[PDB]
Assembly symmetry: D2
Homo-oligomer: 308 residues x 4
Amino acid sequence: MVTSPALRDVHVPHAYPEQQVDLGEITMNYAEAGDPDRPAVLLIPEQTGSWWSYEEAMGLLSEHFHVYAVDLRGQGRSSWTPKRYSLDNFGNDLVRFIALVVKRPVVVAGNSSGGVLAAWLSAYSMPGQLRGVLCEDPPFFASELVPAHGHSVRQGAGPVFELFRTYLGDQWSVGDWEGFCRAAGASASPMARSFVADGIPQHLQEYDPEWARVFYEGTVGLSCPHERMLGQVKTPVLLTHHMRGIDPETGNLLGALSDEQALRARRLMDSAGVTVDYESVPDASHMMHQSAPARYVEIFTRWAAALA
Amino acid sequence: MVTSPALRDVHVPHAYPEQQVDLGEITMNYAEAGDPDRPAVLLIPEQTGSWWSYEEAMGLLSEHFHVYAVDLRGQGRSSWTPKRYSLDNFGNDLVRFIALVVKRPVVVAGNSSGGVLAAWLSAYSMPGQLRGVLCEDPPFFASELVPAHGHSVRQGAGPVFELFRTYLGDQWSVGDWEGFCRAAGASASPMARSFVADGIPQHLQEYDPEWARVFYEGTVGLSCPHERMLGQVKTPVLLTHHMRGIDPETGNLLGALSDEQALRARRLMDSAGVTVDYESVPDASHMMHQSAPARYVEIFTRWAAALA
Amino acid sequence: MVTSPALRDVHVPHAYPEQQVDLGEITMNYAEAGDPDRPAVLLIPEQTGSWWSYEEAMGLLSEHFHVYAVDLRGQGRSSWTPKRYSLDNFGNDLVRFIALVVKRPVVVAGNSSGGVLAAWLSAYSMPGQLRGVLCEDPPFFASELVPAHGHSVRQGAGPVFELFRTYLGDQWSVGDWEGFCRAAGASASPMARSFVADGIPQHLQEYDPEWARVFYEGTVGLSCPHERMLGQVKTPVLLTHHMRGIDPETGNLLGALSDEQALRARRLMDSAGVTVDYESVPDASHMMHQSAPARYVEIFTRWAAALA
Amino acid sequence: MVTSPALRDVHVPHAYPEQQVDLGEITMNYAEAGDPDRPAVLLIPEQTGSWWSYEEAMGLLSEHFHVYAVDLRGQGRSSWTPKRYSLDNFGNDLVRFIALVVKRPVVVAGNSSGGVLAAWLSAYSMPGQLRGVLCEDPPFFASELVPAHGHSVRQGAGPVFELFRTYLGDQWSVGDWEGFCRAAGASASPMARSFVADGIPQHLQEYDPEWARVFYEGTVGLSCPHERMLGQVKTPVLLTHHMRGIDPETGNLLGALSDEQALRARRLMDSAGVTVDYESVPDASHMMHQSAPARYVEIFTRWAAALA
């Protein structure tokens, strides 16, 4: 057997056993850590990341919390659903996971697009499902094609998403890794180059690149403008803001969101009447939970421990 | 006080008392009829219709069923949500209503767009929520801007939706009823002229015309192609097909869906592995549950009684 | 030197010498045949076809006409212009070619998309530039994403355009010919399979597949609805209608346009006040000028000879 | 007779007589000033402006130049063309006007969208038609829905265009001036409030508000990205940059383009190899040719005199 991303037979073992749940349209794959009597935490990966993006952080959080880490649809061992990728479908999948698996109020932490989905749940979950959310370096506004504030996706991560769409393809239908690496290495985007490797990185083998299409094309959030979601949050919010800057050659955003976009997000969430904490860590990498797990967990724990 | 659709102070009493539930993002208004110990039924109105579209049919269905009739978001007394109107948000609202209010498996019946939503639930609800669905004159394919089969919305109901968008406006921000009636009276679409009246009909006063925009502009179902939904239904389906035809002047569809679209929908649901029933009533009006309630209830009851 | 479509060094000699003209934004490549004192004819190829699609027909037409055959932008040796492909840019290129090279009124004949452009010139050229147009098997309506009448591109040639977009790519940026042939051979579209070959056909090597993208995505004609263009033609029109049918498995259109779309196009052009000739040749292939050159030239000549 | 913008019977006399030319698809209305033997100048108004936007500046320019001022399609007495409004159609109209009416090389000056069109001609006219262009406060990038650099239209003039689309409507099909003024008066955009008046201003009565739609919806320039146009200019360019700033409440752009967008435009034109002049007049109103005609003409003349 020659395995392939398109055939979805690429998965490998990890430090925690995996479980699956039927949510109706999809099956969600996930893993669990910690004492089930301790407060529940739901971890949402960044785009291209599976649940095991949190593997090291899970071991540290297990000191105090009952942790669930999930594969979103289009990722990992969860269902791939051509033509169905939207913030509302990702979000409602997570509402169902809470109702069907967790069965208790949760603290949610999500990285990047996962942090956009953490804010989505704060605003749009079923009543009483959430105690608070941590949005770890989220591209508020900057992941939209037509944002209310600041740089668009085409002026931020879009160059990478375009390469994923063109060289990898929906459901890995093209799979031209050599052409991806050629184009990426010649790109003006540093982030594009960070995926260049001899072989396809494991997390990307598990990723449905239709995700990149719906971000690039502005369809993933067409029915979910960020200004309305942010102004309707209903729980405490912790917003962590990592490296960010401007590329001189193009004017494009480096990092997840600009200082302007973070300010506007903070004002909107304040107007919603919730408690907002903002932690600027301008020296931290995008996936702090992976590059500096102890630092991430200390931030999360100090904040979560004071919730309820 | 001069009431106005834009101010949402236009509602009037009906034959059943009204109840409200917080679903999280929205509050949903609904009414209930019948003995709660009898099998549960959920009624979904047509576009521009409130729960009381079913008032007469509810009284007859109360003989054998426990009936819930709902206002969708953007209609009636349920929340209006600018920029959030999509099949997935309407559908997940209904999933939450079943989980939080009904708390038992349901038979779903929906008219027109409501029948599109009934099929949505058959495919995409949470597991075990549904016993079967009735799709009463549903615009499968014909309500999509880019359908896989047959006439597009622009070749069907689009002329009416365009007039709602232009003369009534999102959240009734324009409210030019006189201009609507002038334009509708000169239209080639009989359906358009069917809304012309001296005053605004009560049901339309309760309707958020952003609904019409998202149908006309192809955004309401952008992340929910009908061919994928219909191929993923998981319950028995009854499809009723009322008046339909072709306007010789324009070639446009008259009615909810063509024979070709009904055939393609039936084949897709058959390939999903469910029991499909098809009842053609070519002399029936679009809202049979309103114009011929006894006939509608006989069809529904005969089919529902044979379910489980 | 290893030549490549993306490097645009693939061209070969043909039976006529080639010439180039600066039209401003682009350089147009073309070839000329016949006695320059005889009536001028401009030949527009089908999509993926270069000027030499007409090579055999040119020799026959030279008996009576002064023939120019052109490469459109994105084709052949004419400029490739990323992000600029639209009916209005193709059309205005041709207006400039007439004004700068031909310098006399012309009879225009175009195949498929070239026939759409022949109708465009009939409606939208500069005054007095045209004596008449032949639209050879044109996808009126059927090449639009949202047509006023009949099947959309997604229900016609779209499956082929999708494969060109995904496996060949804008400006041949992907160039996965093996993957194209694999996907095409498994396609339900007979036309997709007609491009399958051991090596890339010469005409396709010269083609910028961004053309297929703008057709598939509905941008090429977004500012040029066919119902308005057809109702504004200003010259005699000959419309030839070749093989057409319906695929039983999918309901999709086979051929360039349906009988319904041809009828509606004929009515619109009649309403414009012009002379319309309609030649149904239901046994002819799509590129009659190439598969049956003598038959094509006899049709063109009988009609052109009676113009002016 | 009760005149109405929708009926296009609202025009009035001006200080110069008006002339019309058939350009093919459209008829273009224009006025002429000065000695025909002097160097030719073509004046392009701002959006919502007719040729007589330049009436005072024409009288001063007549001292040294032969001046043509035009109504674009969708404005003034030139044809209204539903569904056809795009930069490429406006631009090719102007190419035809130069070829059919002026018949000599021209210096072009255009305000706002007209300055976008002046750059369009510099890049895309027929060869030899232009000696140079002046772009008077042009919304480079800022009038695009998805620009390569800086604020989008939704973050700039979009609020005004949205009000034109909703309360005036395509071809003045809604015509709700009272509702426009109510909405415009409550808007955050000063530019919106600048159109509020007891009666409809004369220039707006001549304007087809479908213009506003195609700017707001991102279709007018979909096939004409500004970064490609600006990188392909072929004549000297003068860019005047008037009042601009940031609204602290919203973050939105005030004025035609930001400093960042002006810089990126200058660099692109420099890379095209032309002479670029940039005149910042940060105290000037948007239509300097109207509010300070003598200053506008001094800038234009000083620069034009140094051309050829």
